[PDB]
Amino acid sequence: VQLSGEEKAAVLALWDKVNEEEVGGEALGRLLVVYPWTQRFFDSFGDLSNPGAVMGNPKVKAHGKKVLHSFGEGVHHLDNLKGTFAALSELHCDKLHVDPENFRLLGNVLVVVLARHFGKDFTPELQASYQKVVAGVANALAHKYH
């Protein structure tokens, strides 16, 4: 990913402050509420009818934590994104059949959730760097669809 050396340091320093469970649970829940067709993939998780049931569903929280942990792996391996997510790309293409447009949607919801948690510390410049990161991850996850 085209990221300067000052940019990477700011990205890594913010990740130190990311609670993967809180952020991850909130980002996956907001995806399910805002883009409700994504609920189709998670029928396993039970009741996802109203926002209250989504945000407090323990499986939404646990899965969001797993998603965010894997995001954090990408953040710590920005020079090898395609290889970090190769196995996950196969899983999402071949087993789950997620359209890759949804990877971009989740990445943008994550950015909005980072904004909500960090406030004015989440500057326009730091958002810009995170937009490059989430796009890099979405394209690594789409690699094996191609």
Partner 1 sequence: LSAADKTNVKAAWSKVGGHAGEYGAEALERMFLGFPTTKTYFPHFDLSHGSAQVKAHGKKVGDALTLAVGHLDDLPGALSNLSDLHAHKLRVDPVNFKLLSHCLLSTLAVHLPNDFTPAVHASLDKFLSSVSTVLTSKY
Binding of partner 1 by 61 (CB under 8 A): no
- Residue pair 104/135 in contact (Cβ under 8 Å)? The answer is yes
Q: Does 97 bind a second copy (CB under 8 A)?
A: no
> What DSSP designation does 22 have?
H
**How many residues form the binding site for partner 1 (CB under 8 A)?**
31
Specify the stretch interacting with ligand HEM by CB under 6 A; choose among 13-21, 36-44, 112-120, 121-129. Answer: 36-44
Residue 109's φ and ψ, nearest 5 degrees, are: -60, -40
Counting contacts by CB under 6 A, is residue 42 touching ligand HEM? yes
How many angstroms separate the CA atoms of 110 and 123, rounded?
A: 15
Residue 63, phi then psi, degrees to nearest 5: -65, -40
C-beta neighbour count of 46 within 10 angstroms: 12
Angle of helix 5-15 relative to helix 124-142, nearest 10 degrees, comes to 90
Q: How many angstroms separate the Cα of 121 from the Cα of each of 17, 58, 111, 116? A: 12, 29, 13, 10
Residues in 58-77 at the binding interface with ligand HEM, rule: CB under 6 A: 63, 66-67, 70-71
- What is the binding site for ligand HEM (CB under 6 A)? 38, 41-42, 44, 63, 66-67, 70-71, 88, 92, 96, 98, 102-103, 106-107, 137-138, 141
- What is the binding site for partner 1 (CB under 8 A)? 29-30, 33-37, 39-40, 51, 54-55, 97, 99, 101-102, 108, 111-113, 115-117, 119-120, 122, 124-125, 127-128, 131
- What is the binding site for a second copy (CB under 8 A)? 1-2, 135-136, 139, 146
